[PDB]
């Protein structure tokens, strides 16, 4: 088989974490227009038959707790797993409403060994966030 | 036995080390394209091919507009990182 089995009772979960407002300590400005994105994703994943769950303004800690709880859930009847992160960030880092959080830490809860009910199944992470401070000027075609 | 890091796909809105762009009212360029391409091709194209379309739409149809010359006229290219072992189809 060249294709993932997507004919399970459920397509799976689609956790969308949208952080718009940040603690003064961080310094980052609010992310206006991010609600339009979270809302757009919800509707899109709903049509693809995913069980969407929106989470707004989560602290660095609340993010880890959420991911860990979701990973410890039983996905035996789900085809896959989608996780969207809309927030500020740096290379390999995603920002909670209060501070920095490594990406490798979130995805690890879903490694084949830590999440048996998702082994061999597609685990997608869509990350909207910066990954540095480099600017792409482009070039004329 | 399979690798514990297998079956993961990371769709980054931008290339490593780069800024990601967002429009104050319309939203982030990446999510916009991603939702548009998903709405249009999820019933046909495999996921990787759909993400390639998102790459092209973002790369060609977006350009930054800022009152600060520094952040003006900048482009963006998304970055797909795949450790999938099979083709991903949302339909059956």
């Amino acid at each position: 088989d060249n294709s993932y089995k997507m004919d399970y009772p459920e397509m799976g979960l689609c956790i969308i974490i949208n952080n718009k407002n940040f603690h003064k300590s961080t310094g980052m400005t609010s992310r206006s227009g991010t609600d339009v994105d979270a809302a757009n994703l919800r509707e899109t994943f709903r049509n693809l038959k995913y069980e969407v769950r929106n989470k707004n303004d989560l602290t660095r800690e609340e993010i880890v707790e959420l991911m860990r709880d979701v990973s410890k859930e039983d996905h035996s009847k789900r085809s896959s797993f989608v996780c969207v992160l809309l927030s500020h960030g740096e290379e390999g880092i995603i920002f909670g409403t209060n501070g920095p959080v490594d990406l490798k830490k979130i995805t690890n809860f879903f490694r084949g060994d830590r999440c048996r009910s998702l082994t061999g199944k597609p685990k997608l992470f869509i990350i909207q966030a910066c990954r540095g401070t480099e600017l792409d000027c482009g070039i004329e075609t | 036995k399979i690798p514990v890091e297998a079956d993961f796909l990371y769709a980054y809105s931008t290339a490593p080390g780069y800024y990601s762009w967002r429009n104050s009212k319309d939203g982030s360029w990446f999510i916009q394209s991603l939702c548009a391409m998903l709405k249009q091709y999820a019933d046909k194209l495999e996921f990787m091919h759909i993400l390639t379309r998102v790459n092209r739409k973002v790369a060609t149809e977006f350009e930054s507009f800022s009152f600060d010359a520094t952040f003006h006229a900048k482009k963006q290219i998304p970055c797909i990182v795949s450790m999938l072992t099979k083709e991903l189809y949302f339909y059956h």
């Binding site: 400005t29 992310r31 206006s32 500020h88 960030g89 909207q128 966030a129 910066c130 | 809105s13 800024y19 990601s20 762009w21 967002r22 429009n23 104050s24 982030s28 360029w29 930054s64 507009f65 800022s66 009152f67 952040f71």
Partner: peptide, 5 residues
């Protein structure tokens, strides 16, 4: 306008 993320 467009802003960084």
């Amino acid at each position: 306008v467009d802003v960084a993320x």
